[PDB]
């Protein structure tokens, strides 16, 4: 989604699963066109990954599984 | 797959601490 409009869409870091949240808080953290409560990413990883040619969640996923195996090798 | 959050967050929150603190407590008090 962020690829299509990088200047207006907010990058999501990860999902929030917190039992302690009330409904107002869940509503408050439901942002950046997410279905549930999420944290906006401020690490600039989206910008970085987009610049270096990644365009799909499948590519990001394949990157993550490779890095597990690369961590495993070390 | 979202249901995994309902499993993992409680495990990392309770099961892992209890298991880790229980073991480390028994290890530091072992004579």
């Amino acid at each position: 989604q962020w690829i299509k409009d990088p200047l207006h869409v907010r990058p999501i870091a990860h999902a929030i699963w917190d039992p302690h949240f009330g409904k107002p808080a869940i509503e408050a953290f439901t942002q950046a066109g997410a279905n549930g409560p999420v944290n906006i990413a401020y690490s600039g990883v989206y910008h970085w990954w987009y610049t270096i040619g990644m365009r799909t969640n499948t590519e990001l996923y394949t990157g993550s599984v490779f890095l597990l195996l690369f961590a495993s090798l070390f | 797959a979202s249901f995994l959050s309902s499993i993992f967050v409680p495990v990392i929150g309770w099961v892992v601490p209890i298991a880790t603190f229980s073991f480390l407590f028994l290890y530091i008090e072992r004579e």
């Binding site: 996923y61 599984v65 597990l68 195996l69 961590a71 495993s72 | 995994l4």
Partner: peptide, 30 residues
């Protein structure tokens, strides 16, 4: 997003560095 299958593969692949991290940690303790 990514499929439920892909998430389950990642978790199973993540057991590999999980196992090797344990083996390294135990070896480093010696």
């Amino acid at each position: 997003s990514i499929s439920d299958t892909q998430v389950y593969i990642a978790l199973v692949v993540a057991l590999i560095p999980g196992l090797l991290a344990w083996r390294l940690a135990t070896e480093l303790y010696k």
